[PDB]
């Protein structure tokens, strides 16, 4: 929109936002002691948030209202209503506060990227970080340096491995992504629909958004063809969970179209589904992605101008425009009879319902108003970012090499990922209090370190090889830190392949033939084809370290030297190179279609051979896994569904059966243990998924000898499939619960009865209406 020359947003993946949208605002709180509003209903603490918000907007002139239909809410000086910035970010720590150059509020804790947080498979870990981010976010708010709402979390799934933003997500599995959303949102908002909101959270991006730019398919003009079945079974569950169970107070609509219609002008998505089917809060508000309302016009061409795009987005259910479409066109839209003042007011009343519920009109004694810089120091000082990295690092391969022998007194650190700063933080990060590179990790672990760059991330020169080989000879063992970073994968930048970049592999190879202990760190969010490192016996060890944040190097060093043990596991498939070549990344169809070239997408449908599988992880010890009841027997569907469901809003929310096992440490070392429980079945229509996650746990501190019992509730909804109309359906038949990919322990069960619908999928009568 603010382009200075012709820009084709069918190909360009970054909008040109006007400065008003990008303007950071100085936060203050309205005054209900003596300001113009003190004697009005908005300051009456005995009325609902909706009545108080409604009374507030009633005072505005139209000009003042429109100034507050955008993310950069300019306020109303006349009523002592401050400017308010809706655009906050908390992907993995405070992301978009008004950071001071130095001193107080110059940094906030930078936790690992979500792709790495999820790998820990510790639902409590995700919760605890949210609580920490939530507190730091409040410290910034209370020093007038931020809002009380953030555009987090990303609960899209890493469907296709090229996605430049898959690093922001809890991986390719809807079940794990759902649980991520629930724990983070409940942590951000300060409880399950609680009396006072701590921080207003925002599930993004709703929906069908999992491509930036692959082969010039710009997110801003993408129209994704998705079946009601896959929309229901895959693309929306995390949103259903955020909306229905986490009681998320906000949803951001995506840039893309789905079945002809941009998300933010999509009645079916916003009204029929989110509002009429997923029980989105009565007072909840929808925010456009920055520029998304403009995109309904340019380049989707769903609306013929920015005034019609504004009208179509408001009438569909987009409450706040991240952008300048509402602010600069909602007046045109009104004068052209495209919307009513009441339409434009609906979005603002909803926003301020949430701010009232966050104590915004309640003065200095309100909840959370007492949080200071000292709470950022104290919460950071817990070093949960270190802990998070230590739990989330994944061992893909090991032959006794790790941990490092008593013998190894010196070690050669090599590769483009050894000497790094902000590479640790992935994206949507704020200034961190420090950044410990892997190099600085090993120096601090007290081994003699010999550094050599060797190669740059995307180099074809051998210039650096000589110096690296000679450093590797000096030393007792080789740590090679390579992979990808945001120079390869970022927002507006999908990968065009899923292979290691440059000549990093060529260098790892030469280091293999030196009879030296060779450890490879594969870093980045997306997965790279490590097939060559798999079937090469001289590469001893392989670690996926994702994006491990402010203390990543202490974490990686401490895993390697065995000061801590790894238990993390992959939360995406590592596909072979050819996967990214054989069918287009903008084909949303998950089910294998031989005619098209689609081998089926995600662990659930893929009919080729992963290099490393979704769920794959290793430990510095061995586990004996087994169970009391290895056939939990039959259950009647009509019986399960027709008993009381005391404690649950929905019958299908109940535990169908526990998955139980015993897990004994039968190896050298103390360690944590992670489990991912899958189901598979021939129940329901063909085709059939291979398996699908229905739970996960992390057991802690298993000394050798020690046993702990793993207990994973399989809920009724978790084993239901989905029909051709999108209804979630319990089908009768034969089911197996398998522990990890090796199927350590198998509990079988039969669903007896007739089919039952547990969620009715509304018909889409609006998308293609004439």
Ligand X SMILES: *[C@@H]1O[C@H](CO)[C@@H](O[C@@H]2O[C@H](CO)[C@@H](O[C@@H]3O[C@H](CO[C@H]4O[C@H](CO[C@H]5O[C@H](CO)[C@@H](O)[C@H](O)[C@@H]5O[C@H]5O[C@H](CO)[C@@H](O)[C@H](O)[C@@H]5O)[C@@H](O)[C@H](O[C@H]5O[C@H](CO)[C@@H](O)[C@H](O)[C@@H]5O)[C@@H]4O)[C@@H](O)[C@H](O[C@H]4O[C@H](CO)[C@@H](O)[C@H](O)[C@@H]4O[C@H]4O[C@H](CO)[C@@H](O)[C@H](O)[C@@H]4O)[C@@H]3O)[C@H](O)[C@H]2NC(C)=O)[C@H](O)[C@H]1NC(C)=O
Ligand Y SMILES: *[C@@H]1O[C@H](CO)[C@@H](O[C@@H]2O[C@H](CO)[C@@H](O)[C@H](O)[C@H]2NC(C)=O)[C@H](O)[C@H]1NC(C)=O
Residues interacting with ligand NAG, by CB under 6 A? 3-7, 9, 11, 20, 23, 25-26, 63-64, 67, 74, 104, 215-216, 298, 373-374, 377, 419, 421, 451, 453, 455-456, 459, 461, 463-464, 589, 593, 595-596, 655, 657-658, 680-682, 711, 713, 734-736, 743
- The residue among 11 and 366 lying less far from ligand NAG, judged by its C-beta, is 11
Quick one: 251 or 449, whose CB is closer to ligand NAG? 449
Restricting to residues 262-301, name those near a second copy by CB under 8 A: 271, 276, 282
Q: Which of the residues 245, 283, 289, 697 is marked catalytic? A: 289
State in angstroms the smallest separation of the CB of 632 from ligand NAG: 9
Work out how close the CB of 753 gets to a second copy at its nearest, in angstroms, rounded to a whole number.
9
Report the residue closest to ligand NAG, judged by CB: 464
Is 47 an interacting residue with respect to a second copy (CB under 8 A)?
no
Shortest spacing between CB 181 and ligand X, in angstroms: 17
Which residues, listed in sequence order, are joined to residue 250 by a DSSP beta bridge?
A: 285
Nearer to ligand X, 125 or 471 (CB): 125
CB of 679 to ligand X, least distance (A): 23
309-368 binders of a second copy (CB under 8 A) = 315, 334-335, 337-343
- Please state, in angstroms and rounded to a whole number, the distance separating the CA atoms of residues 681 and 731: 10
Cβ atoms of 714 and 694 within 8 Å: the answer is yes
Binds 736, which of ligand Y, a second copy, ligand X, none (CB < 5 to 8 A, cut-off by type)? ligand Y
Q: What order do you get walking across the sheet with 410-414 strand by strand?
A: 394-397, 539-546, 518-523, 478-483, 410-414, 448-452
Closest separation between CB of residue 600 and ligand Y, Å?
Answer: 16
| Residue 743 interface partner, choices ligand Y, a second copy, ligand X, none, CB cut-off 5-8 Å depending on type | ligand Y
Q: Which is nearest to 111 in space by CA: 85, 136, 91, 87?
A: 91
Rounded to a whole number of angstroms, the distance between the first and last alpha carbons of the chain is 30
| Beta pairing class for 410-414 and 478-483 | parallel
CB 717 within 8 A of CB 653: yes
289 in active site: yes
When asked if residue 5 is in the footprint of a second copy (CB under 8 A), the reply is no
- Helix, strand, or coil (residue 522): strand
In a 3-state reduction of DSSP, which class is residue 231?
A: helix
What is the nearest approach in angstroms of ligand Y to the Cβ of residue 622? 22
Residue 770: CB minimum distance to a second copy, A: 10
Looking at the Cβ atoms of 179 and 264, the one nearer to ligand X is 179
Point out which span in 130-138, 145-153, 214-222, 254-262 binds ligand X (CB under 6 A): 130-138
Q: Among 10, 98, 128, 497, indicate the residue that binds ligand X (CB under 6 A).
A: 128
Q: Map residue 264 onto helix, strand or coil.
A: helix
Closest approach of ligand NAG to the CB of residue 340, in Å? 20
Q: What's the token pair of residue 718?
A: 């978790």
Q: How far apart are CA 604 and CA 172, in angstroms?
A: 10
List of residues 6+ apart from 16 with CB closer than 8 A = 1, 2, 3, 4, 7, 291
The radius of gyration of the chain's CA atoms, rounded to the nearest angstrom, is 26
Shortest distance in whole angstroms from residue 347 CB to ligand NAG: 17
**Structure token digits, residue 37:** 């509003």
Q: How far is the CB of 719 from ligand Y (least distance, A)?
A: 12
d(CA 455, CA 415): 6
In the DSSP assignment, the letter for residue 632 is E
Q: Which residue's entry shows tokens 């919460």? A: 379
Residue bearing tokens 């057991």 = 699
Nearer to ligand X, 25 or 424 (CB): 424
- What is the spatial order of strands in the sheet that 756-759 belongs to? 721-722, 728-730, 756-759
Binding residue (CB under 6 A) for ligand X from 125, 413, 449, 477: 125
The rounded distance, in Å, linking the Cα atoms of 235 and 183 is 19
- Scanning residues 103 to 122, which ones bind ligand X (CB under 6 A)? 122
- The interface with ligand X within residues 373-412 (CB under 6 A) comprises 379, 381-384, 387, 391
4 C-beta neighbours (distance < 10 Å), count: 6
Distance, in Å, from the CA atom of 262 to the CA atom of 743, rounded to the nearest integer, reads 42
Interacting span for a second copy (CB under 8 A) from 60-68, 452-460, 475-483, 562-570: 60-68
Asked if the peptide bond before residue 299 counts as cis, ω within 30 degrees of 0, the response is yes
> Which entry of a second copy, ligand X, ligand NAG, none binds 122, CB below 5 to 8 A by partner kind?
ligand X
- 284 burial (CB, 10 Å; 0-12 / 13-18 / 19+) is buried
Judged by beta carbon, residue 119 or residue 424, the one nearer ligand NAG is: 424
Using the rule CB under 8 A, give the single segment among 512-520, 587-595, 625-633, 634-642 that binds a second copy.
634-642
Strands 707-715 and 478-483, by their bridges, are: unpaired
What's the closest the beta carbon of residue 195 comes to ligand X, in angstroms? 14
Where are any strands of DSSP class E within 686-745? 692-702, 707-715, 721-722, 728-730, 733-739
Q: In this complex, which beta carbon is closest to ligand NAG, that of residue 177 or of residue 229?
A: 229
Q: Which residues bind ligand Y (CB under 6 A)?
A: 680-682, 734, 736, 743
Residues 732, 755: Cα–Cα separation, whole Å: 6
Size of the site for ligand X (CB under 6 A): 17
Q: Which of residues 638-657 bind a second copy (CB under 8 A)?
A: 638, 641-652
715 binds a second copy (CB under 8 A): no
Task: Report d(CA 730, CA 658) in Å as an integer.
Answer: 18
Q: Which does 766 bind (CB under 5 to 8 A by kind): ligand X, a second copy, ligand Y, none?
A: a second copy
Those residues whose C-beta lies under 8 Å from the C-beta of residue 87, and which sit 6 or more positions away, are: 21, 71, 72, 96, 147, 151, 290, 322
* Residue 54 binds to a second copy (criterion: CB under 8 A): yes
Classify 655 as helix, strand or coil.
Answer: strand
Q: CB-wise, 379 or 459, nearer to ligand X?
A: 379
Contacts of 715 (CB under 8 A, 6+ apart): 652, 653, 654, 655, 656, 694
Per CB under 6 A, does 183 bind ligand X? no
Catalytic residues: 289
- Which residues in this chain contact a second copy in the complex, by CB under 8 A? 40, 54, 58-63, 271, 276, 282, 315, 334-335, 337-343, 638, 641-652, 727, 729, 754-760, 763, 765-766, 769
- Which residues in this chain contact ligand X in the complex, by CB under 6 A? 122, 124-125, 128, 131-132, 135, 379, 381-384, 387, 391, 672, 698, 700
């Amino acid at each position: 929109q603010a382009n200075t020359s012709y820009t084709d947003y069918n190909v360009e993946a970054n909008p040109d936002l006007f400065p008003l949208c990008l303007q950071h605002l100085n936060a203050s709180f309205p005054d209900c002691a003596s300001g113009p509003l003190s004697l009005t209903p908005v300051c009456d603490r005995s009325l609902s948030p909706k009545d108080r918000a409604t009374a507030l907007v009633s005072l505005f002139t139209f000009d003042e209202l429109v100034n507050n239909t955008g993310n950069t809410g300019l306020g109303v000086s006349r009523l002592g209503l401050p400017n308010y910035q809706v655009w906050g970010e908390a992907l993995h720590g405070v992301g978009r506060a008004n950071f001071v150059e130095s001193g107080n509020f110059s940094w906030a804790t930078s936790f690992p990227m979500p792709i790495t947080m999820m790998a820990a498979l510790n639902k409590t870990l995700i919760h605890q970080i949210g609580t920490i981010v939530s507190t730091q976010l409040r410290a910034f708010s209370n020093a007038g340096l931020g809002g009380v709402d953030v555009y987090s979390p990303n609960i899209n799934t890493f469907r296709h491995p090229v996605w430049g933003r898959g690093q922001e997500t809890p991986g390719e599995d809807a079940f794990l992504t759902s649980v991520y959303g629930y724990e983070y949102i409940t942590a951000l908002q300060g409880g399950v629909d609680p009396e006072t909101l701590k921080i207003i959270a925002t599930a993004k991006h709703y929906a069908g958004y999992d491509i930036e730019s692959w082969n010039n398919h710009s997110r801003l003009g993408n129209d994704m063809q998705i079946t009601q079945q896959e929309l229901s079974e895959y693309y929306t569950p995390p949103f259903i969970v955020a909306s229905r169970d986490a009681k998320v107070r906000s949803v951001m609509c995506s840039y893309n179209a789905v079945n002809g219609v941009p998300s933010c002008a999509n009645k079916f998505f916003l009204q029929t589904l989110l509002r009429d089917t997923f029980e989105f809060s009565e007072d909840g508000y929808v925010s456009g992605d920055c520029g998304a309302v403009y995109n309904v016009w340019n380049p989707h061409g769903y609306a013929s101008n920015e005034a019609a795009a504004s009208a179509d987005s408001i009438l569909a259910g987009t409450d706040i425009d991240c952008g300048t479409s509402y602010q600069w066109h909602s007046e045109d839209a009104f004068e052209d009879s495209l919307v009513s003042r009441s339409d434009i007011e609906r979005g603002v009343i909803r926003l301020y319902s949430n701010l009232v519920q966050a104590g915004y009109f309640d003065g200095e004694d309100a909840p959370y108003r007492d949080i200071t810089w000292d709470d950022v120091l104290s919460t950071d000082a817990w070093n949960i970012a270190y802990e998070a990295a230590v739990e989330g690092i994944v061992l893909l391969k090991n032959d006794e090499t790790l941990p490092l022998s008593k013998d190894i007194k010196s070690v050669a650190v090599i590769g483009p990922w050894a000497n790094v700063t902000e590479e640790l933080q992935g994206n949507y990060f704020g200034p961190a209090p420090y950044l410990i590179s892997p190099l600085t990790g090993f120096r601090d672990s007290g081994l003699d370190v010999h550094y050599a760059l060797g190669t740059n991330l995307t180099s074809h020169s051998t210039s650096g090889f000589e110096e690296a080989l000679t450093a590797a000879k000096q030393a007792d063992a080789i740590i090679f830190a390579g992979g990808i970073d945001n120079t390869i994968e970022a927002e507006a930048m999908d990968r065009e392949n899923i292979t290691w970049p440059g000549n990093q592999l060529d260098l790892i190879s030469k280091l293999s033939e030196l009879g030296k202990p060779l450890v490879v760190l594969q870093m980045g969010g997306g997965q790279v084809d490590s097939s060559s490192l798999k079937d090469n016996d001289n590469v001893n060890a392989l670690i996926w370290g994702g994006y491990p944040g402010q203390s990543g190097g202490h974490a990686l060093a401490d895993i390697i030297t065995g000061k801590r043990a790894p238990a993390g596991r992959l939360v995406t498939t590592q596909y072979p190179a050819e996967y990214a070549e054989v069918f287009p990344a903008i084909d949303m169809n998950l089910r294998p279609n031989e005619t098209s070239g689609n081998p089926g997408q995600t662990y659930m449908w893929y009919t080729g051979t992963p290099v490393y599988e979704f769920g794959h992880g290793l430990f510095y010890t061995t586990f004996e896994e087994s169970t009391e009841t290895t056939d939990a027997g039959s259950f009647n569907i009509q019986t399960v569904l027709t008993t009381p469901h005391s404690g649950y809003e929905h019958a299908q929310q109940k535990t169908l059966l526990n998955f139980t096992a015993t897990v004994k440490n039968t190896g050298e070392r103390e360690s944590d243990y992670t489990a991912l429980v899958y189901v598979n079945t021939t129940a329901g229509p063909a085709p059939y998924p291979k398996k699908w996650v229905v739970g996960f746990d992390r057991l802690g501190g298993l000394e050798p000898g020690d046993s702990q019992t793993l207990t994973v509730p399989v809920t009724v909804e978790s084993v239901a499939r989905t029909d051709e109309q999108g209804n979630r359906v319990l089908y009768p038949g034969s089911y197996e619960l398998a522990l990890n990919n090796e199927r350590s322990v198998v509990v079988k069960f039969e669903l007896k009865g007739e089919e039952a619908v547990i969620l009715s999928w509304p018909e889409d009568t609006t998308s293609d209406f004439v």
